[PDB]
Amino acid sequence: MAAIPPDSWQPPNVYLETSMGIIVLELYWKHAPKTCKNFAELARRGYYNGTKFHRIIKDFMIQGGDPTGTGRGGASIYGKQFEDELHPDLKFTGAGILAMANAGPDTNGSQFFVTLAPTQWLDGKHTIFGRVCQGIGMVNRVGMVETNSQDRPVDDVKIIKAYPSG
């Protein structure tokens, strides 16, 4: 009853070609279409290309830059700030996840942090957006490496290019 000859697959995987190492991510095109489009657009337009990770907490997580890495010049495709895409369903405990960073009520930025270690205390503080199925290993080393006495990476980690799977 009513058959649609044509079909649509759409690659739900993203390939971030970082200087540190290549890692695949999983975007939620169901509840995350909003942030998903932003993350994909920013990477497609050529914003993430050239940036790097400034925040790296040993045995915890590592947040990547975007808004000039200093809140100097950063804006979302939809606008400056939007409504948080938080929805009771995901969790930030399983080592290797991609949660969208925020600032305040109805105030979201363009940062992204991947949790490499179990965290229940912060399980709810930030919002989700993607996952790291194939790549957590590359991130693990980034946390095991030598860091500063605050949150500065002693090693060299940056992004050279990024493209979605085809």
UniProtKB/Swiss-Prot annotation:
UniProt protein name: Peptidyl-prolyl cis-trans isomerase-like 1
SUPFAM superfamilies (UniProt xref): Cyclophilin-like
Gene3D superfamilies assigned to the protein according to its UniProt record, in alphabetical order: Cyclophilin-like
Activity modulation notes: Inhibited by Cyclosporin A.
CDD domains tied to this protein: cyclophilin_SpCYP2_like (cd01922)
InterPro entries: Cyclophilin-like_dom_sf, Cyclophilin-type_PPIase, Cyclophilin-type_PPIase_CS, Cyclophilin-type_PPIase_dom, Cyclophilin_A-like
SS bonds (residue pairs): none
Organism lineage: Eukaryota, Metazoa, Chordata, Craniata, Vertebrata
Organism: Homo sapiens (Human)
Tissue specificity as recorded in UniProt: Ubiquitous, with the most abundant expression in heart and skeletal muscle.
Positions of cyclosporin A binding: 54-65, 70-71, 99-104, 109-113, 119, 125
Catalysed reactions, as listed in the record: [protein]-peptidylproline (omega=180) = [protein]-peptidylproline (omega=0)
Record note on what altering A99T does: In PCH14; strongly reduced interaction with SNW1; strongly reduced protein levels in homozygous patient's fibroblasts compared to heterozygous or wild-type cells; in transgenic knockin mice, produces a pontocerebellar hypoplasia-like phenotype
PPIase cyclophilin-type domain location: 10-164
Disease annotated for this entry: Pontocerebellar hypoplasia 14: A form of pontocerebellar hypoplasia, a disorder characterized by structural defects of the pons and cerebellum, evident upon brain imaging. PCH14 is a severe autosomal recessive form characterized by progressive microcephaly, and poor or absent psychomotor development with severely impaired intellectual development apparent from birth. Other features may include hypotonia, spastic quadriplegia, and early-onset seizures. Early death may occur in some patients.
